[PDB]
Design a protein around this ligand. Structure first.
Ligand SMILES: CCCCOC(=O)[C@@H](NC(=O)[C@@H](N)Cc1ccc(O)cc1)[C@H]1[C@H](O)[C@](O)(CO)[C@@H](O)CN1O
Ligand SMILES: CCCCOC(=O)[C@@H](NC(=O)[C@@H](N)Cc1ccc(O)cc1)[C@H]1[C@H](O)[C@](O)(CO)[C@@H](O)CN1O
Lengths: 319, 319
C-alpha cells in the first residue's frame, strides 16, 4: 500500500497538486479514473508531449483507469495557455486529419478495446451538442469574470490582444472534467504545468455548479536540460513520435546524446526500470563513464516502447 | 549528514536542478556559498518574493554562507524573464530609492555585519566599471546567439518586440555569477522558476569562459493556491513586507485566511517548525477543523519573523 504515490515521488513526476492529503488518501483507498487531454494541432506528438501520457500508464499499473482525451471540439478554438500570440484557428478539415494521426499514436501507448481498461474519448462528442443560449445559462452563469481574470495564463495574452474565443477556452476545458467526472467518474486530471490554469478552472466549475465530486488535479514537471536549452527541439526541429517525421534511428540518437548531468533523471522519467536497476546504472555511470551505459539503456528502452523492438534494431541498423 | 537536502525535500522547496548528484555531494562534502538576487524595482517586496530568500536562511542553518544580491546595475535595464511587454527603464533616481527600501528589508531577514556570515552585494559595483569594447571582447565573445535564441524566456518576447537591451540582460546576470563565483567562491544560485533561464545562462558562460568552477543552479517552486488564483495578490493588491503598505494586521489576516487544502504546505514553506510539530498541526487540522489551528500558527509564525513579536501583537490588537 502507498506504493504508487511513493514511486511517482521517487522519480519526481509530480509538481503541483490541488489537495495533497485528499489525493494520497484517494490513491490509497480506491481505484481512480483520471485523464489527460490532447488538442489535435499536429498529426503527431513529439517527445515533449510524452511524459504526461507515459505517466498515465504508471497509474494504470497500480490498477487505475486512464482516459486519453482528444479535443475535436476544443482544437477548433485554440488553447492560449502559455501563449503570446493568437492561435489562429484551423479548418474543420485540418483538425479532422490531425485527430487521425494523433489518435493512432495513443493506440501504441495504451490498450484500447477492453471492457474496463483505458478509454479514449473525443470532446466534440458533447460540446458539439451545446448551444449559445444553453451554454450561457447552464454553465456560463457559474463562472466569474474576476476568477478568470488574474488567472496566470491570461495575463500573458491580456497585455496584448486576447479575443473572446481565446479567452473563453478554460470554461471549455472545465466542462470536459465535469462531464467526464459525471459519466466515467473521473476524479483526477493530469497535465503539464501550462495546464494548471485550465485544470483548476475545472475543479472550481464543478464546485460551484454542484458540490465538487472529490475532484483533484495534479501536474508533471517541465523536462529541463542541464544547460537550459529546450528539450525535444534540436535545430532541425522537434523529435516526433512518427517515424515518417523523425526516423527511429534519429529518434534513438537523440536519446544516446543525453548528458551525464541528466541521463539518470531522464531514466526515472521515461523508462519502467526499477529503483535498484536505475541505481545499478547510476553507479556504473559515475565510475566507468566512457561506457555511456546509462545513455545506451535509455535510448534502447524508450525506442522499444515507441517504435517496437523491430525498429529499435533499425534504430542502429544503418551505418 | 545529508540532513539539509532531506529537509528541503520533505518541505518541497526544490523544483529544478542543473546537476542533482553534484549538488547532493557538494551540500554534503563542504560549506557552500550560494546567492539569490533582487532587482530594485519596488521599494518593498511582497510575499511572492519571500520563499526564495527564506530558503537561503534554511541553507545558512546547516552552516552555509548566503549572499543577498541587489541589482543596482541590472535594475537599470529590466529583466524580461516571464514577460510579455517591454519593461520600461526607470531613472537612476527611482532605482537609488528602491534599493534603499529593499536593502532595508533584507536586513530584517538576515544578519549582515559579521566577519564570515551573510554578505549583501550590489552588482553596479562591478558592471559599472565595464565598458562596451571591454564587454564585447572579454565576455560577449563567449556567448552564442544560437544558445540564447530558443531559450524559453526569450520566445515570449521574441514574438512581439524584444529590444537589444532587454535581450542582453542574461549575459548581465551571467557575469554576476562568474564574478561572485570568483571573488566569494559562489557555487550555487537559487532563484524562482522564472530565473531558470538566467541561472543556466551563467553556468554556461563560466563553463566556456574558464572551466565551470563546480557551479550549480537550483530553483524553488511556484507558490500555487488550490483554487488556482494567484497567491500574494488579493484585489486591493499585493501583500507587501512593508508595514507602511500592508499593515501587520492586514498581513496577519492574509495568512489566517488560508484554506485547509494548502495550510500545511504553506506551513512547510514559510515556517521553521519541525516535522513532528508540523505533523502535530496536521492531525488537529484534519480532525477538529473548526479550531483553524494550522492557519492560526502560520499567521503568528510568519508575522513574528517579518514584523517582530511586538507588531505580531499589533497584528491582533485592533478590533
Ligand atoms: C500532440 C498535440 C498537442 C495537443 O495538446 C497539448 O499540447 C497539451 N494539451 C492542451 O493544450 C490542452 N488544452 C488540451 C485539453 C483538451 C480538452 C480537455 O478537456 C483538457 C485538455 C498537452 C501538452 O502537449 C503536454 O505537454 C503533453 O501532451 C502537457 O502540457 C499536457 N497537455 O495536455
Ligand atoms: C523585490 C523586487 C523584485 C526584484 O527581483 C525579482 O523580482 C526577482 N529577480 C530577478 O528578476 C533577477 N533577474 C534579479 C538578479 C539580478 C542580478 C543577478 O546577478 C541575479 C538575479 C526574484 C523574484 O522576485 C523571486 O520571486 C524572489 O525574490 C524569485 O523569482 C527569485 N528572483 O530572483
Amino acid at each position: 500500500t502507498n506504493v504508487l504515490i511513493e514511486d511517482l515521488k521517487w522519480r519526481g513526476l509530480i509538481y503541483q497538486q490541488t489537495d495533497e492529503q485528499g489525493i494520497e488518501d484517494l490513491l490509497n483507498k480506491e481505484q481512480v479514473t483520471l485523464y489527460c487531454g490532447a488538442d489535435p494541432t499536429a498529426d503527431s506528438l513529439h517527445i515533449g508531449h510524452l511524459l504526461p501520457f507515459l505517466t498515465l500508464r504508471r497509474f494504470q499499473e497500480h490498477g487505475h483507469r486512464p482516459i486519453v482525451l482528444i479535443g475535436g471540439g476544443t482544437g477548433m478554438i485554440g488553447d492560449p495557455s502559455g501563449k503570446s500570440e493568437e492561435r489562429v484557428l484551423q479548418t474543420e478539415e485540418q483538425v479532422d486529419k490531425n485527430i487521425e494521426g494523433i489518435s493512432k499514436q495513443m493506440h501504441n501507448i495504451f490498450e484500447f478495446g477492453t471492457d474496463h481498461g483505458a478509454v479514449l474519448v473525443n470532446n466534440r462528442d458533447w460540446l458539439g451538442q451545446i448551444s449559445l443560449i444553453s451554454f450561457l445559462r447552464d454553465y456560463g452563469k457559474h463562472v466569474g469574470v474576476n476568477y478568470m481574470l488574474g488567472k496566470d495564463s491570461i495575463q500573458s495574452r491580456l497585455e496584448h490582444g486576447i479575443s473572446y474565443t481565446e479567452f473563453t477556452y478554460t470554461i471549455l476545458q472545465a466542462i470536459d472534467f465535469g462531464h467526464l467526472n459525471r459519466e466515467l467518474n473521473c476524479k483526477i486530471q493530469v497535465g503539464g504545468s501550462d495546464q494548471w490554469g485550465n485544470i483548476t478552472s475545472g475543479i472550481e466549475l464543478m464546485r460551484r455548479m454542484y458540490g465538487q465530486t472529490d475532484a483533484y488535479g495534479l501536474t508533471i514537471p517541465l523536462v529541463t536540460k542541464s544547460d537550459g536549452k529546450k528539450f525535444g527541439k534540436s535545430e532541425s526541429g522537434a523529435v516526433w513520435l512518427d517515424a515518417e517525421k523523425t526516423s527511429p534511428y534519429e529518434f534513438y540518437q537523440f536519446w544516446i546524446n543525453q548528458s551525464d548531468e541528466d541521463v539518470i533523471k531522464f531514466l526515472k522519467y521515461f523508462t519502467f526500470l526499477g529503483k535498484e536497476e536505475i541505481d545499478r546504472l547510476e553507479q556504473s555511470k559515475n565510475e566507468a563513464p566512457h561506457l555511456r551505459e546509462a545513455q545506451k539503456t535509455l535510448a534502447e528502452e524508450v525506442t522499444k516502447f515507441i517504435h517496437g523492438e523491430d525498429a529499435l534494431n533499425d534504430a542502429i541498423r544503418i551505418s
